[PDB]
Write a protein that binds this ligand. Structure first.
Ligand code: HPA
Ligand code: HPA
Ligand code: HPA
Lengths: 282, 282, 282
């Protein structure tokens, strides 16, 4: 398989956005978890439904449609994705990552990715925020990769490196900012592992994932980071630990979508101010 | 990719079966290993070749065609799949699992899955029967999942839990029943790991599989359990350890399909009476 | 999915080659790394561009097109693939492995595979040559396998064993030959792990790969060995360690395609004489 989008498809979509808004963002943010309300803090906001933008993959999100919002957050011009695409919905990785390449063509230089994740690291608690220090790409091991197919030289190289995907300087800025917020809990940092989903893991699967060294497990983000790094975007991301995974055979209960939603709801306040504060440091 | 079957496809097939037999099963059994002869113990049996049932995936099995047999086993009304589908034959998971959803629509409430597996756990011996306590889904890690694509709300939820896939109470019943059979060998219990096949594993692959915590390795069953749990079927399954995997570089010999067949032949007698006895406890 | 080539497709291509050259090779070699110049040591060489051979997958290689070269190397009649196909370019495994089955139909009995790999084993140094003793097939775990689909009985069996894929006797011959070359460095030997690519691994991915027991990591070769063993070809292969993988978070630098190329350039001299010497021992 190969990318179903020609370079021209990306630029056509980009040219369309440019001619419909005066906003010219430098930062792009893909919202997840309780970051959904972040759009409410933008100034001079302009919203575009995914369905009205040519070439954009059609979709929505939990309880709300997918919208692309342009605006100024804490003095920084940015564009946000309110709702993303997941392979478990049927989308191939080249559709999932379509927005990342368009952002590049709009002049965006920094990408901020966020998600909800199940905690594998025993020291994590629900509500914890983990800076993504590194990732493990399981679908990648099998060849499921957004870069599979002929390489588009206009975006990047054939064999991009990933060992430096998560910007070091940004992670440092994140720690300083967290300190200034006076938070009692420590800002976590670790390895995110991605799998396909949509079902939740079994005890045995969680144990091996942890033994493989992963700290948090999720069903997104990685394809986006790959493509973003391929085209030279500075990347920074974090996971909202929405639940602790059942690692014990004596299952007291089980992971449920409801609980991850509640967590996203309860941490929204601090997630938003955290991202807002970081804008100034980018 | 998404499921190529609409909800209506499943119900059409179900309505067809209902109008062609007076049997109304509560239990569904997918036979593997030496359980192939189990059909011979059914009362008021009615057989349907897979090729005469609308929408059913076409196929067969080792030395025999695939047939759907309805009948009463030890006082319990059930339907059995004599031969299953495997991804290594070319079938996508949505074809492999087609029967599971039809069983649901027929009124079936319990699913019994059996298979042949290579023993990874050093304490296992050829002929051993292992109750599946948990599973590791390698194809799932890459996105190869029977639930990939839009979710059919009429079957279940978008994010189903799998940590409780193998019924606890049923596994307890299995141990009691095994005791009543006066078997000298202990009833094993463990983690089953699934991979695609059709080739047999290498020494290095077997060592990592064991390190990942798996007790037995096979090329089926997991997709069926996923779909079954998604639609609310109580699941119980076991593996017939047909051979011990070569974990030593000094390969004395090598896994062969012939030997797994012999094992299936020699254990048939006890596999059948075991499943027969369990019917009363469901 | 299934193989898109019928048995007849393979034999048509084979018959075409036979009627266009008087060469009748017993050995087939798939060149990688610095082995690209090996064609320059052939006698009575005859070259065929991949694009002029019916049914052959279209492609090329780094800095040069793909060519099939027939010739005599150190007294042995062989055919060489100057450039191979990779799944990361978009090719399904049944296209990648097409040449292996044609070689079989030409009368070839031995296959020599070579590649460039990143060193995971701490004792390896750039320039090291590692005899492939065993492999780990990650894409295989998910079902991505060149044998997926209906089995062609005219090539081999439905469930081929892989625990003896790398010929024992050949590896012994390789050690003796290396000794006769007076090389100061020891001939390495180990497990090769394959992943899809095209991006290079992250620190976390490299650590788990090493923990899984792999010594070298690459993006090819395994599909070819599978198919070759399926049709009864004696297989022998080795990896040129082109770089040491970044296993440390304090990334001093990062894997780059340039460096792997330099390594391939600097070791070419000994790679060629090594393969040349081995011809006599086959
Ligand atoms: O437990 C989980 N598992 C996988 N993905 C998740 N996303 C949020 N929680 C989880
Ligand atoms: O050794 C084995 N490996 C994989 N699947 C199997 N099914 C029966 N035996 C085996
Ligand atoms: O570091 C590496 N990683 C993966 N494949 C490779 N092929 C050469 N070097 C490498």
């Amino acid at each position: 398989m190969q990318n179903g989008y020609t370079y021209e498809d990306y630029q056509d979509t980009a040219k369309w956005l440019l001619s419909h808004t005066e906003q010219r963002p430098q930062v792009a943010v893909i919202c997840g978890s309780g970051l959904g309300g972040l759009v409410n803090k933008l100034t001079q906001a302009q919203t575009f439904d995914y369905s009205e933008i040519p070439n954009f993959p059609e979709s929505t999100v939990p309880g709300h449609a997918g919208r692309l919002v342009f605006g100024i957050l804490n003095g920084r011009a940015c564009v946000m994705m309110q709702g993303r695409f997941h392979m478990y919905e049927g989308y191939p990785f080249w559709k999932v990552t379509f927005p990342v390449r368009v952002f590049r063509l709009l002049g965006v230089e920094t990408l901020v990715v966020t998600n909800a994740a199940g905690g594998l690291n025993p020291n994590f608690e629900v509500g914890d925020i983990m800076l993504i220090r590194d990732h493990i790409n399981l679908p990648g091991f099998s060849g499921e990769n957004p870069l599979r197919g002929p390489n588009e030289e206009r975006f990047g190289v054939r064999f991009p490196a990933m060992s430096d995907a998560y910007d070091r300087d940004m992670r440092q800025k994140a720690h300083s900012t967290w300190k200034q917020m006076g938070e009692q809990r420590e800002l976590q940092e670790g390895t995110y592992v991605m799998l396909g989903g949509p079902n939740f893991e079994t005890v045995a699967e969680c144990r091996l994932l942890r033994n493989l060294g992963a700290d948090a497990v999720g069903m997104s983000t990685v394809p986006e980071v790959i493509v973003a790094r391929h085209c030279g975007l500075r990347v920074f991301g974090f996971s909202l630990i929405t639940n602790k995974v059942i690692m014990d055979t004596e299952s007291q209960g089980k992971a449920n979508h409801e609980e991850v939603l509640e967590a996203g709801k309860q941490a929204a306040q601090k997630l938003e101010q955290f991202v807002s504060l970081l804008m100034a440091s980018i």
